[PDB]
């Protein structure tokens, strides 16, 4: 049982796509220049690695953007969990629009979408990728891992937020 993979992203060698330095940058709050376009400006997202697999990346077409919220979605987020299945992607910042004891003040959250089936490169890698993304996730708001699309569960996000003092996710919507 001897394997022999490459030597870079196999033991974790990613480096944020740079657009990730914008992922955290977005999904913030009223930062939306004007949220009527911001809604369609990419403000929620999942990411993974690269063509050869590296930089936190958009390995496909995941990504919510707050604007969709109300089309194929409606403000929660599990739809976004649906964006990420299990065989491909792990770090995701989704503009979290949720009230709290503080009230609706939007606070996105880091998503280590780590499915028990994803490829190794998106497990052994993220192990050290959460440091690279971190160097760009200056403020993650919510490092939240999920090895099941349920750890993302808004009710559970209503625990990561609704497990202390919010008002929605754990209160109004869930």
Helix (H) or strand (E) holding 20: helix 20-23
Q: How was this structure determined?
A: NMR
Q: Are 146 and 113 in contact (CB under 8 A)?
A: yes
- Give the Cβ contact number of residue 99 at 10 Å: 18
How many Å apart are CA 126 and CA 165, to the nearest integer? 29
Among residues 76, 95, 68, the alpha carbon closest in space to that of 172 is found at 76
- Residue 93's SS3 state is strand
Q: Starting at the edge strand that comes first in sequence, how are the strands of the sheet with 110-113 ordered?
A: 44-47, 91-94, 110-113, 143-146
How many Å apart are CA 141 and CA 97, to the nearest integer? 12
- Residue 80's SS3 state is helix
How many Å apart are CA 172 and CA 60, to the nearest integer? 33
Find the farthest-apart pair of alpha carbons in the chain and give their distance in angstroms, rounded.
56
Query: 9-34 b/e with 16+ CB inside 10 Å = b?
Result: beebbbbbbebbebbbbbbbeeebee
Phi, psi of 69 (to 5 degrees): -30, 95
Domain ranges within the chain, ordered by starting residue: 1-174
Q: Are 98 and 107 in contact (CB under 8 A)?
A: yes
Q: Are 108 and 27 in contact (CB under 8 A)?
A: yes
Going by CATH, does the domain composed of 1-174 fall within 3.40.20.10? yes
């Amino acid at each position: 049982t001897m394997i022999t993979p490459s030597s870079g992203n196999s033991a974790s060698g990613v480096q944020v796509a740079d657009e990730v330095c914008r992922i955290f940058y977005d999904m913030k709050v009223r930062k939306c220049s004007t949220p009527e376009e911001i809604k369609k400006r990419k403000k929620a997202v999942i990411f993974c690695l690269s063509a050869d697999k590296k930089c936190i990346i958009v390995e496909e077409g995941k990504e919510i953007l707050v604007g969709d919220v109300g089309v194929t979605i409606t403000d929660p987020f599990k739809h976004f969990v649906g964006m990420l299945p299990e065989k491909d992607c792990r770090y995701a910042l989704y503009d979290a629009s949720f009230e709290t004891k503080e009230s609706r003040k939007e606070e996105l959250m880091f998503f280590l979408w780590a499915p028990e089936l994803a490829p190794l490169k998106s497990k052994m890698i993220y192990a050290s990728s959460k440091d690279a993304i971190k160097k760009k996730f200056q403020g993650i708001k919510h490092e939240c891992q999920a090895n099941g699309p349920e750890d993302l569960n808004r009710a559970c996000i209503a625990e990561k937020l609704g497990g202390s003092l919010i008002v929605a996710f754990e209160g109004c919507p869930v």
